[PDB]
């Protein structure tokens, strides 16, 4: 495998929850006297007071640089065009890399099979995890997620972060005795590439698969920047609730290159009733569930009109005397 | 490879043009006294007069059946819900299978490496090719495509066929001395699955690739039943004009299984000026071309903000002291 | 008022149901031996046999002409680009105008206040009503609408007509002892112009109003050619179920002028459970209903964040010391 | 007229530029030592140093309150969920109302026909104008708009403001000797309600009209958070370039009330070549211009297939012997 797949599996093997790192972030948040709201300024003062790091807002960085840290003089420059929550994320990432280096190193050490480059990629993944666990302190964030019935927009509003950051954190609430809904988080683009997979436990799309066009995550770009929802049934009978939305943040100019992603959060149908997104939806009727697969070549459904490729198991008859609206049927 | 890939390659190796079969379709159209306009009605009586086949419009066929042929009674049943052009397509498909069986077998014989199942799939593909070349007689269709400046909707209106059928036929106009624009034809779904590839000549997506989310074909579902267009530049500098549109032919009920596809037609930029779809677009300015790829793992571009995966030829730079809006950058 | 408003009110006063005309269409359908399926051909033979009218499919008419009738030689020319159901509609319209002229004249005579031009416009409206009542014979169409739970696509498939034609006919099922769901039918464009209003009984948007942006009919263009649905609550507490879909049929060329409309069907919430479109929706929860109005200037809702104009009744305070996300609040 | 129309006309009569107020904002920005970048922080301390006003970021304000000012304690509370540029806008609005009160009163006095309520609405409009001219200092903003070729996203990024705010300021650059492109600015919703009109000079939609569904501004909701563009020709031959985009600023919860607007900027075609949005479009070909109107009842075009209502100057032709794809044709 490749290094990003190695690190995806590194997080999947740990149920997408790193107890030592999460508790470290929360403990530092509390001991520093942090308060939710305007964390970028408080994080600047924590960098200065605890690490001698001077944080400066720089509009002189290249267009694509979100931050740069100069370790010779200990100066952290943060992009002016980042919103406060993004600035705080950048600062907390660097905070993990300079202030939690040994804890990150030992956590990486717990997987001896990781390749040389996968270890650095995992270091960056764990720094991102720390930044998420610092911006969204575990007990407070879990506590608000339950009060708000998992409304991602309201969570982002209360904590001053975006949709993708909230979904990231929601997929990590696997602390023993204070678990949230077990989620699978995915990020896709317009061509169906899934560039992020994180899961609390085993799901169909945790590691591979996900190229079924009836899956609602791919429909997010058809209805941009509005939450889509679906009650999906996999070919093995297991049922899931999926919500997805496009994240499209540029301001790189009309001519510039644009980045467009969709973020999806899925869970077992049995949890759907605790989500605000199930409002108005009937969840006790298996006939209203949408039948999806994992990708046409690994999907054994026999009567799918959307089917793009034949199922690789077994083969269908070819009939010169029949025409059908079900491709590769028999 | 699998059999549908074998037949995709069978047609690709022949420049998507089967001269003997195409000329057979045109000669039969002319000798039978056919006329564009109501071809379904004329095809029914040509079946009766020439092959003793009785064509019946059956509203008792199963919901998913487009046709069924009973060779014992020589009875062809066609679905009532097919529009006239689709009925004509079904009848001409059966006409190829019963009246051009030996020439189709002889054409198949020219590829000795075809597997046993690939031969049946190729028989059905060649019957479809014949039906297309019969509904859209080569010389008449070519002259209409040039007169209409390749307006696909206007061609469908003149010949009483749909969008996908016109694009199919347009990608086959490789008869020596009467060439149309050389096209690559693709059919995709919302998850990026490309279920059809047909090519007049060598193109980047003739056989594999096409999972770039900046390619306009994947943007077709965001703007349904609207033609989208793009001037694309591949990483090797070669430039192309792409037109695409969703086809949604259903009415299987609100609850029923739904069919959603997008069809794309691509050509060299040098031909774009004879397309009606080039109206209003500047074609002589390489800075206005959109830079796309074939798929992130096989794309070597250095500064793509949309990038989903690291390029396999490259290596993963990791910088703990920098944050960037360019994922997996060089 | 203007003539189209005069005729809209002419139909509204009659509960959108013309008993004499509807029974005439159904009686002629039965006495002529018509059968659902391929009505265009049977209507051609009925024109010839009963009225001496020769029906011909003409590709020589101007682009915009659907039909033309030459009364000196009794020849009806029908556009080749019309699908069979549209051809049948055209033929039945002319059939009403030549074969039901006196019945139409007396029905018009029952409204003495109609202006001179409104009488001709009403003649055309009643001919259209006859064509709808002939293509969709009352007892058979009502009988299928109940069996199919009002699935508009399935009704169109069975009767070979489009979405707008089915919705038209569904809004007319007010025959005593065999009434369908009482519907209001509207047609809008992208700018909110409502160009058709028909209602079985009194509804909020029967004659005026309908410019509320939270009403789902205006959202149809955001999700083109897919059915949208909404449980709406008017400011007076009454609740309604709304379904809408875009109808976009051109083939007038990429450069040509395009016609894009959305068609909406609404009913009281108490009927929603008989629609297939209520599947998966909770209808016994007044908290999940969306609060809409009739247009901001005639809407008295006090806490609408979407509000575009102040409500004309009373006035709100202007406060220099407050900023609010509720425009024109107080 | 009503008071919001009175104030729309107050600004329209002044070419959407208030010279004394604009120069006051710029002079105060310069004399205070302000710098673009973190204006919310600098505005808080300018309030404290110059007016004794204590600015507080209050997460205890009601959900819908952007600000509240207590003049007894001179305490300005600003909503925590406002991004920095919006916070700066709120503070500068209050700054206009407390620190430029007499000049605003004097500017209002120049329109003696303003009703008593229109004067308060004009006071708030002028405070908003001051806030815009303070956040976006005239000469600096004008030079940046010219350097960036009017790229609205890039201007928002440089100045830390949103799309609507930039378009607002762009429509005000009518200072003699330093003119920007003369623009008309509109804000619409999904139902076609135009809730804002601001104009540098006389335009067709400066005061009324704008309900043409072929106008690209109404197409913005079909392509959400994507800039749409159009070369439009009014029925009198005059041609315009239009850019539009939806603004969706919410996160009031999945169930909460939602805000959806589209903002459009229009100018003479002769200026289109200095816009970045003109990249790739041919502007010297009047056949490629789209023919639009001001609203169907006030539009005299003869062959519009989209037409919703009969033109009021015309008369209704009715032909019982013809069917046409042109509703209400001449
Ligand atoms: C996959 C990756 C390359 C994508 O890069 P990118 O597309 O440039 O985007 P980023 O993930 O850096 O940031 C985008 C959003 O994700 C959010 N995010 C990323 N990791 C997060 C985490 N662990 N917790 C919370 N939020 C997180 C950021 O806050 C950001 O929100 P914003 O856009 O509103 O500012 C990048 O996330 C990465 O390097 N991750 C670490 C390696 C890893 O875990 N790989 C496994 C892949 S499954
Ligand atoms: C690939 C395949 C299974 C797809 O099946 P499907 O999804 O049921 O769709 P079909 O292709 O049968 O029909 C869809 C449209 O394509 C059109 N079409 C298909 N082949 C055509 C041809 N050779 N010429 C013109 N039109 C054609 C049909 O007319 C139809 O138009 P319509 O929707 O208005 O009725 C089927 O086309 C097939 O078996 N093709 C032959 C095998 C082959 O060539 N495989 C390699 C393809 S990569
Ligand atoms: C309003 C009007 C001018 C619109 O014209 P148009 O936009 O050219 O469209 P048409 O209504 O002629 O036809 C469009 C669809 O409506 C359908 N339709 C129209 N009247 C119908 C009726 N009474 N029953 C069933 N279907 C009907 C047609 O079948 C057609 O379906 P199709 O597009 O798939 O072929 C036209 O309907 C008319 O003249 N109506 C009669 C006058 C009237 O009743 N005015 C009151 C206005 S509320
Ligand atoms: C019309 C009105 C009620 C709309 O209220 P609203 O829908 O709550 O929206 P607001 O205009 O208050 O704010 C929305 C955006 O417009 C921007 N805006 C408003 N006036 C502006 C100005 N003069 N310059 C720059 N930006 C301005 C705000 O900054 C805000 O940007 P944001 O969304 O990123 O925060 C309100 O703008 C108003 O009272 N205006 C003054 C009265 C007036 O001029 N009326 C005639 C208009 S036709
Ligand atoms: S066969 Fe149908 S259900 Fe299975 S993956 Fe393909 S589209 Fe999805
Ligand atoms: S790296 Fe960028 S250009 Fe290349 S395939 Fe991926 S998205 Fe397309
Ligand atoms: S005030 Fe709100 S609910 Fe009322 S019509 Fe306007 S947008 Fe609709
Ligand atoms: S008649 Fe046509 S061009 Fe004129 S306003 Fe109506 S839709 Fe627009």
Author numbering:
A (entry chain A), B (entry chain B), C (entry chain A), D (entry chain B): 152 to 481
Give excerpts from the publication.
Upregulation of the methylcitrate cycle (MCC) is required to assimilate and detoxify propionyl-CoA, a cholesterol degradation product. We show that MtPrpR has a novel overall structure and directly binds to CoA or short-chain acyl-CoA derivatives to form a homotetramer that covers the binding cavity and locks CoA tightly inside the protein.
Interestingly, the Se-Met protein crystallized in the P212121 space group with two axes of very similar lengths (a = 142.37 Å, b = 145.96 Å). However, the native protein crystallized in a similarly packed unit cell but in the higher symmetry space group, P41212, with a = b = 144.87 Å. The asymmetric unit (ASU) of the P41212 crystal contained two protein molecules and was equivalent to half of the ASU of the P212121 crystal. The cubane-type [4Fe4S] cluster resides in the C-terminal region with three of the four irons interacting with Cys447, Cys450 and Cys455 in a 447C-X2-C-X4-C455 motif which appears to be conserved among all MtPrpR homologs. Therefore, the predominant CoA was built into all protein chains and the CoA molecules fit into the electron density. The adenine group was sandwiched between Phe240 and His319 and was held in place by π-π interactions. The C-terminal loop region of neighboring Chain B forms a hinged triangular lid that covers the CoA-binding cavity of Chain A. The cluster appears to stiffen the hinge region, as indicated by the lower local B-factors, making it difficult for the lid to open, hence locking CoA inside the cavity.
